[PDB]
């Protein structure tokens, strides 16, 4: 009744067991480039991301303007004082992210499916975000579901702690996951 | 600090 695959080409995109993807479930624009929160004008000048609000800021537009991308921690002036991307939607709980556990073709109708293992944002755990959390941090739950591959939006990239900081230039779809979160026991375990 | 992309991966 099912034919399982290690990998599947779906709509000219290769999906493989262990891949991480954005998902729009049945029961529930995608801009490449974000605006600077200061000038709102397109530019070749390098744009950095605030650790807190995740807004974009041209280096040359900061006060005082920066020449280089700051190494390590950085927040913008607004967080100092105290259309949406797919990542923005995920982190606001308006779409899902999952790791691909299985892929198969349903024999009865030829439809392709995955077994999704859901990620969860800290806000959606009953105890919520903690001070030590990062804004791009996800937990990998022990919740699973059968989802049609048609419901997959596109890949995201979920990094273990050892590889997260080195992915600082890898774009908007990069997330951190260190822990498995059991939703029933409300407990954490290292993926490591 | 992370950078903002100029194009999708
Ligand atoms: Zn600007
Ligand atoms: Zn900010």
Describe the structure.
It is classed as transcription. Keywords: PHD finger, BAH domain, multivalent readout. The assembly is dimeric. The complex is a heterodimer of chains A (192) and B (9). Chain A is mainly β and 192 residues long. Chain A folds into two domains: 138 residues, no CATH class; 54 residues, no CATH class. Chain A contains three helices and 13 strands. In chain A, strands 1, 4, 7, 8, 9, 10, 11, 12 and 13 form a nine-stranded mixed β-sheet that branches. A two-stranded antiparallel ribbon of chain A has the order 2-3. In chain A, strands 5-6 form a two-stranded antiparallel ribbon. Chain A is globular, with a radius of gyration of 19 Å. Chain B has 9 residues and is largely without helices or strands. The interface between A and B is medium-sized, with 25 and 9 residues. Bound molecules: zinc ion (2 copies). One zinc ion (ZN) binds next to loops of chain A. The site of one zinc ion (ZN) has 5 residues of chain A, from loops.
């Amino acid at each position: 009744k099912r034919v399982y695959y290690n990998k599947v080409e779906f709509d000219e995109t290769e999906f493989e067991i262990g891949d991480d993807v954005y998902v729009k479930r049945r029961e529930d624009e995608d801009p490449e480039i974000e605006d600077c929160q200061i000038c709102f004008k397109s530019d070749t000048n390098i744009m950095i991301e605030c650790d807190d609000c995740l807004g974009g800021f041209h280096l040359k537009c900061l006060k005082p303007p920066l020449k280089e991308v700051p190494e390590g921690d950085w927040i913008c002036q607004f967080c100092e004082v105290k259309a949406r991307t797919m990542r923005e939607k995920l982190l606001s709980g308006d779409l899902w992210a999952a790791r691909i556990d299985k892929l198969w073709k349903e024999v009865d109708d030829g439809v392709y499916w995955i077994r999704a293992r859901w990620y969860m944002i800290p806000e959606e755990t009953v105890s919520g975000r903690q001070p030590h959390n990062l804004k791009r941090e996800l937990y990998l739950t022990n919740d699973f579901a059968d989802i049609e591959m048609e419901c997959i939006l596109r890949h995201c990239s979920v990094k273990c702690p050892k590889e997260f900081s080195k992915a600082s230039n890898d774009g908007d779809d990069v997330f951190l996951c260190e822990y498995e979160y059991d939703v029933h026991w409300r407990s954490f375990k290292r993926l490591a | 600090a992370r950078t903002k992309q100029t194009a999708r991966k």
